[PDB]
């Protein structure tokens with residue numbers, strides 16, 4: 294059991310570089326439109342406090358350099374949709390996959406294709422945090438990198454990377470250009486709210502632990518859903534809903550461990566700690582696998 | 592720090608399915624050759640102790656079903672090299688990247704593209720353990736999945752998955768079909784061998800922690816490599832090689848911390864424990880990030 298991303302090839306074939314002045318970042322090329330963060334229209338003067346409609350009106354198509362590898366694509370139109378810029382180009386992307394734009398919920402996971410100057414460099418899994426940040430791996434030049442899931446040949450893009458907060462966590466938008474979380478596309482210090490732990494994911498990963506032979510944390514205690522929720526809340530864990538319990542059923546049935554029983558084991562983990570021990574090789578409770586992630590991998 | 596894989600696209604375009612009778616697994620299509628585990632020529636009652644020479648002589652090109660999705664690639668030649676089959680097909684793969692075949696050492700990491708029936712399903716980072724196994728994530732149908740690194744536009748293939756051992760770890764070969772470790776391609780319980788901690792990578796992780804301003808564990812001492820190696824073994828850590836010292840060069844230069852001084856620091860952590868303290872947020876020392884991996888994530 295390891296963190297596992299979707300194969301990135303369908304997204305690699307869409308990554309380009311977008312430049313405006315000395316400002317450069319990554320864009321997503323689908324059919325005849327390139328999508329990228331609007332921040333690219335900022336000179337370093339603008340970055341601190343942009344008025345974007347103002348900066349945009351003062352721009353022309355020829356102010357946009359789009360490169361796809363070696364070839365420069367010519368911009369025939371531009372528009373802004375929230376924090377996303379859309380550049381119409383004269384040429385369709387022959388590698389466009391079947392795709393959708395979706396907005397994800399906290400707790401859900403996705404694969405991130407980190408890219409620099411329109412070149413893919415790495416792929417990994419992240420979760421949307423309850424506080425709407427993501428704990429990614431991103432360096433200068435990563436702006437515009439995207440996150441996605443794949444289902445039967447369809448790429449559902451759900452994230453476009455914008456910025457890193459002071460704490461080192463990451464903030465960005467969906468592909469309609471709306472931020473996840475209370476952030477703005479301005480170069481100013483922004484804090485996120487207090488984060489909480491994705492309880493249903495921890496339960497899923499506990500079930501992974503059992504499928505993979507790691508069982509030391511199971512107990513014979515039991516608990517009601519409400520009494521587990523009281524303890525979870527006390528520990529800044531998200532509450533567990535009946536929907537979450539239902540979604541855990543296939544894992545429960547697989548291992549023969551009732552959901553409320555796995556809740557009782559987790560309760561004890563919260564109250565006692567792991568007493569030096571590990572689960573699935575981790576000293577910490579892991580909350581970035583979903584029940585689907587677990588099922589798919591197991 | 593996160594475990595990060597290379598983007599998988601260049602390898603996704605090389606994945607095929609190979610089937611002999613009803614036995615089926617994944618193959619790798621580069622130019623006009625498909626490479627796959629020779630295990631594919633075993634029927635069920637061959638799997639336990641195959642005679643691969645014997646099984647192969649009975650084979651013709653027309654026994655091999657190779658498919659790129661639903662498209663069949665006609666086989667026009669076949670041969671066996673150590674534990675891999677090579678099938679010459681009549682079409683050069685237009686998605687072939689620039690590539691090489693490499694044999695890695697323990698400690699080196701690589702991306703694995705897990706595949707089922709020729710269809711890629713996931714990608715993740717693995718390190719080669721000192722006992723020549725990997726701690727992968729693989730189900731039934733994953734045989735023939737490959738591990739790789741990408742350096743610029745060149746894919747270096749280093750691993751072809753064969754089998755899961757009784758403890759749940761994985762064993763396979765390089766792309767010349769030579770197993771990593773004492774294993775054989777027979778469906779027989781084989782035990783891994785006692786594993787050890789990858790010292791070179793723990794050192795890289797300590798350098799990473801220094802780069803990030805986390806440096807309490809830096810002590811005031813130095814060591815010879817021999818002394819360090821002798822102590823290392825008493826704590827089930829791997830001894831360092833000359834090549835290890837060399838691959839730590841960039842990190843040593845970036846931090847100003849001589850390799851042997853960092854060895855002295857690690858030695859104290861071995862002999863004294865962590866004093867209820869952490870490094871990069873953690874009480875456990877990470878041994879699956881190579882010096883290259885750390886440089887990649889920090890700069």
Ligand SMILES: Cn1cnc(Cn2c(=O)nc(Nc3cc4cn(C)nc4cc3Cl)n(Cc3cc(F)c(F)cc3F)c2=O)n1
Pocket residue numbers: 315316317318330332333431432433434435436455456457477478479480481
């Ligand atoms: C360490 N890190 C982690 N993720 C990121 C992502 N990221 C980034 O890549 N770039 C940013 N600013 C830019 C600077 C440029 C310099 N040139 C020559 N071109 C540049 C283009 C960009 Cl986008 N930022 C900062 C940032 C980006 C935004 F989109 C935003 F709204 C506010 C911000 F403060 C950044 O975080 N870096």
Ligand SMILES: Cn1cnc(Cn2c(=O)nc(Nc3cc4cn(C)nc4cc3Cl)n(Cc3cc(F)c(F)cc3F)c2=O)n1
Pocket residue numbers: 613614615616628630631729730731732733734752753754755761775776777778779
């Ligand atoms: C749980 N797990 C993790 N990795 C693996 C890999 N793996 C695999 O995928 N297949 C194997 N045997 C086969 C059975 C087949 C049944 N049909 C219809 N077709 C089959 C093809 C294969 Cl390869 N094995 C076992 C195995 C494979 C080898 F290549 C070998 F040399 C020894 C072995 F014991 C396997 O481990 N499963």
